[PDB]
Amino acid sequence: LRQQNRQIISYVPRTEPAPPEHAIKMDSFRDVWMLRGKYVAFVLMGESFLRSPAFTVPESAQRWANQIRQEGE
């Protein structure tokens, strides 16, 4: 029989992520934010925030958000 030795403690780096860029601009469209692809897909009604299905073309998302905001009080 033997006796157990003291354990050796180690650790790992935190590997901090990279911040996003979020290069955006509001000229006249009000729905022309630039994130990726569709680039905008934003809508906010009521006390909570809801996520759009991210229509790739800007006009479709724009008028869908408009017609949603008109019917959504």
Partner: protein
């Protein structure tokens, strides 16, 4: 840091940049109160946040391991040895005097 109530996932960790996608994600999970840090560019410099970002340690144990490695390079760290070294460094009356 804010965690989800359904799956218990970490929606956003402490001391990270907040963006549109992040706020949308943490607001679709049912959060109503959000607090940030008030930092200026000439009066309240955010050097603590930058130091935390640079810092690769995770917890007390990682900090103790790093301190032990810095103090005694080439020696395998031990929990008890590192704790004793930290206690004796500045919190021991036999080795520290502030008359």
């Amino acid at each position: 840091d804010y965690i989800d109530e359904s799956t218990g996932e970490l929606i956003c960790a402490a001391n990270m940049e907040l963006s549109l996608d992040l706020l949308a994600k943490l607001s679709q999970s049912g959060h109503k109160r959000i607090e940030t840090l008030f930092t200026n560019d000439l009066d309240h410099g955010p050097y603590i946040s930058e130091t935390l970002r640079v810092d690769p340690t995770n917890d007390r144990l990682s900090a103790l391991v790093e301190i032990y490695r810095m103090m005694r390079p080439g020696e395998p760290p031990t929990r008890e040895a590192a704790e004793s070294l930290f206690e004796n460094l500045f919190f021991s009356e036999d080795r520290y005097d502030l008359s």
